[PDB]
Scaffold this active site. Sequence first.
Site, PDB file in Angstrom:
ATOM      1  CB  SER B  37      -0.975   0.008   1.183  1.00 30.34           C
ATOM      2  OG  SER B  37      -1.936   1.044   1.031  1.00 30.34           O
ATOM      3  CD  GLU B 105      20.471 -10.136  -6.407  1.00 29.75           C
ATOM      4  OE1 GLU B 105      21.339  -9.357  -5.959  1.00 29.75           O
ATOM      5  OE2 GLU B 105      20.679 -11.359  -6.570  1.00 29.75           O
ATOM      6  CB  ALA B 108      13.579 -16.186  -8.499  1.00 33.06           C
ATOM      7  CG  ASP B 150       7.619  -5.609   9.090  1.00 30.74           C
ATOM      8  OD1 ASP B 150       6.942  -6.347   9.826  1.00 30.74           O
ATOM      9  OD2 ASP B 150       7.169  -5.166   8.002  1.00 30.74           O
ATOM     10  CE  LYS B 152       4.579  -9.428   7.655  1.00 33.80           C
ATOM     11  NZ  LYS B 152       4.764  -7.941   7.679  1.00 33.80           N
ATOM     12  CD  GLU B 154       3.698 -13.254   6.912  1.00 34.13           C
ATOM     13  OE1 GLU B 154       2.562 -13.160   7.402  1.00 34.13           O
ATOM     14  OE2 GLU B 154       4.715 -13.527   7.582  1.00 34.13           O
ATOM     15  CG  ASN B 155       8.635  -8.224   5.723  1.00 33.92           C
ATOM     16  OD1 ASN B 155       7.820  -8.083   4.795  1.00 33.92           O
ATOM     17  ND2 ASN B 155       8.917  -7.250   6.561  1.00 33.92           N
ATOM     18  CG  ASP B 168       8.431  -4.212   4.255  1.00 31.23           C
ATOM     19  OD1 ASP B 168       7.243  -4.512   4.529  1.00 31.23           O
ATOM     20  OD2 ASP B 168       8.829  -3.029   4.233  1.00 31.23           O
ATOM     21  CB  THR B 185       3.821  -8.266  12.017  1.00 23.38           C
ATOM     22  OG1 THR B 185       4.646  -7.684  11.002  1.00 23.38           O
ATOM     23  CG2 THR B 185       2.681  -9.034  11.369  1.00 23.38           C
TER      24      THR B 185
HETATM   25  N1  LIG Z   1      13.263  -8.354  -4.324  1.00 23.05           N
HETATM   26  C1  LIG Z   1      12.098  -9.040  -4.404  1.00 23.05           C
HETATM   27  N2  LIG Z   1      11.980 -10.132  -5.178  1.00 23.05           N
HETATM   28  C2  LIG Z   1      10.837 -10.834  -5.267  1.00 23.05           C
HETATM   29  N3  LIG Z   1       9.716 -10.519  -4.606  1.00 23.05           N
HETATM   30  C3  LIG Z   1       9.691  -9.438  -3.795  1.00 23.05           C
HETATM   31  C4  LIG Z   1      10.906  -8.629  -3.645  1.00 23.05           C
HETATM   32  N4  LIG Z   1      10.608  -7.640  -2.793  1.00 23.05           N
HETATM   33  C5  LIG Z   1       9.311  -7.800  -2.427  1.00 23.05           C
HETATM   34  N5  LIG Z   1       8.762  -8.868  -3.028  1.00 23.05           N
HETATM   35  C6  LIG Z   1       7.370  -9.344  -2.853  1.00 23.05           C
HETATM   36  O1  LIG Z   1       6.521  -8.250  -2.494  1.00 23.05           O
HETATM   37  C7  LIG Z   1       5.892  -8.518  -1.246  1.00 23.05           C
HETATM   38  C8  LIG Z   1       5.683  -7.251  -0.440  1.00 23.05           C
HETATM   39  O2  LIG Z   1       6.882  -6.496  -0.326  1.00 23.05           O
HETATM   40  P1  LIG Z   1       7.088  -5.582   0.977  1.00 23.05           P
HETATM   41  O3  LIG Z   1       8.352  -4.802   0.765  1.00 23.05           O
HETATM   42  O4  LIG Z   1       6.988  -6.511   2.172  1.00 23.05           O
HETATM   43  O5  LIG Z   1       5.793  -4.619   0.882  1.00 23.05           O
HETATM   44  P2  LIG Z   1       4.798  -4.225   2.097  1.00 23.05           P
HETATM   45  O6  LIG Z   1       5.575  -4.387   3.388  1.00 23.05           O
HETATM   46  O7  LIG Z   1       4.514  -2.767   1.788  1.00 23.05           O
HETATM   47  O8  LIG Z   1       3.620  -5.196   2.013  1.00 23.05           O
HETATM   48  C9  LIG Z   1       6.791  -9.530  -0.552  1.00 23.05           C
HETATM   49  O9  LIG Z   1       6.061 -10.413   0.307  1.00 23.05           O
HETATM   50  C10 LIG Z   1       7.393 -10.317  -1.691  1.00 23.05           C
HETATM   51  O10 LIG Z   1       6.575 -11.455  -1.987  1.00 23.05           O
HETATM   52 MG   LIG Z   2       6.475  -2.463   4.746  1.00 23.23          MG
HETATM   53 MG   LIG Z   3       6.001  -6.591   4.370  1.00 20.76          MG
END
Ligand SMILES: Nc1ncnc2c1ncn2[C@@H]1O[C@H](COP(=O)(O)OP(=O)(O)O)[C@@H](O)[C@H]1O
Ligand SMILES: [Mg+2]
Ligand SMILES: [Mg+2]
Lengths: 270, 334
Positions: B37, B105, B108, B150, B152, B154-155, B168, B185
Amino acid sequence: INRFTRRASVCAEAYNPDRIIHPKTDDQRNRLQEACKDILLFKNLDPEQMSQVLDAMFEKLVKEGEHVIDQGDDGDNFYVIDRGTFDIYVKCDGVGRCVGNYDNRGSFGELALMYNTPKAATITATSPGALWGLDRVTFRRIIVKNNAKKRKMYESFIESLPFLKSLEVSERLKVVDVIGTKVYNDGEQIIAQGDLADSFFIVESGEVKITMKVEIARCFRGQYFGELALVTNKPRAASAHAIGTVKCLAMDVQAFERLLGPCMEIMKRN
Amino acid sequence: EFLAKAKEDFLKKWETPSQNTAQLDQFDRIKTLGTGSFGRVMLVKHKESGNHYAMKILDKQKVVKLKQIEHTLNEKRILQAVNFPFLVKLEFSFKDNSNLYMVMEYVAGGEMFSHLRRIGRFSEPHARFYAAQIVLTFEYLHSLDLIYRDLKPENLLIDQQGYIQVTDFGFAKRVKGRTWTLCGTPEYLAPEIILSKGYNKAVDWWALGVLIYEMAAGYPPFFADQPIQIYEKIVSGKVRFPSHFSSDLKDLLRNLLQVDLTKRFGNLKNGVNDIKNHKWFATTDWIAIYQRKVEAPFIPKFKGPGDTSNFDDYEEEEIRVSINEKCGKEFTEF
Ligand SMILES: Nc1ncnc2c1ncn2[C@@H]1O[C@H](COP(=O)(O)OP(=O)(O)O)[C@@H](O)[C@H]1O
Ligand SMILES: [Mg+2]
Ligand SMILES: [Mg+2]
């Protein structure tokens, strides 16, 4: 399944520490106060943090059928009921369903005090009532300004110890994080003449009276004592007693050493 | 001894940060990798190099409206100014009328979250391999007086080599005294944060506990359907361990999940060593892990350059860029 649902981040408005009083009746206060003490964000606060916050809680009164709060409609406001009755209903789709009641008691929406979270139900006033709101930002501020103040400078304290001058700042902060509080009442004994010396104190307010059995010393705000406890565990030099109503900082030493090592290792620094 | 350079190589970058080093039309918006967001990580085809990257898109208006301006420059200043094996490398940053853009970078492997839910849970040795990596990173980070704030699944992303990349930095902050912002979180918040005590590094370590518990247990230690109730449980610190936890594990956890700062691992006299030297990490070759001369539990199944098989799918919207700069005053430092 939804164990596959991700866990979104949460975040409140910031504030770095570097007036507001809404009036209410002696009663009104006690009632709200004992309505909050069981709430996570309130179970804790020292009675003045507690007190600045009752202060800060504004009066909202409502006409019957008035939407006290609307589902989906926002939340940076937590409310405890003073007077009134209330219906709760949530529109999950689709269906629109009365759920539960509130009869001149209860509160709701405290999560809003942490970060924004849109009310889940709409609260409708069955009849004439009034309640106490509290915005999140106003609240974070009271609570943070306080610990910020009521933390550094605790410090003129910690760093006013001749035993501790040779600390580096971060180390002192480490100690600020965890040093505890004790309120003592006139005549209540603080330190005993023979007890395993385990902690040093600093009068926050009131005064202490050290005595050996004939008064050897008297401590006021700012000053420490039982300090030898840092270098020698051997049994208590003397005894401490509360002259009036005294509040002290209390640092168990085992704790201390876990963080910084043996105090003497520090004096030897420079 | 080597390390101290890191610090200087950082300070340098940090005061004089890379600013505007590309524009949208050098990459080909391939696929959405993630929504935030606002939001929406994109896999991108870089036109000339053909090199592939991930580009975090950020609508200045949302940020701005969500009182998130600081956090955003923080993310970036920090994130160009840093360097570590398990830290995601930032290739370019730049801005335009509507959005902020960061090109890292592309990792994947997908999310450790993805893997975990799919797989169920990690073997102690498996979790231990990740954990080790996170430990190091936090070390390097705190060395510069930066907290991540942050952590987790997911990060955390996996690289083709099976290793980890921290993702993140929206909460990462350079804190020397003690900072105060309530963020992170829910499932991962340290008690001192929940309670507006003010804090620094120890909050990162508390997080570490939570992550490991989640990896091995297959779920987090503090749980409910109502957030407040999670919080309540956090603040008491009391936690059940799943039947199947090595003794050495339950121990370590008890020391990370310490409400009592005078007791929490990481915050103590020997700092981070109490961890590296803890018995669970016995089999751990920290010198070797660093260099990635260890072999990864799991290797992401990758096909060819620019495969997104490991990521979920979102419905693609098209990037609109207003004819008018927005919130340009605010993001000048960018
Ligand atoms: N360098 C990257 N390569 C591949 N996927 C990425 C990369 N950076 C972020 N993502 C994907 O984007 C999602 C959200 O990124 P994030 O920086 O955590 O945004 P937010 O915290 O605003 O939700 C991650 O969970 C990941 O799946
Ligand atoms: Mg964030
Ligand atoms: Mg995040």
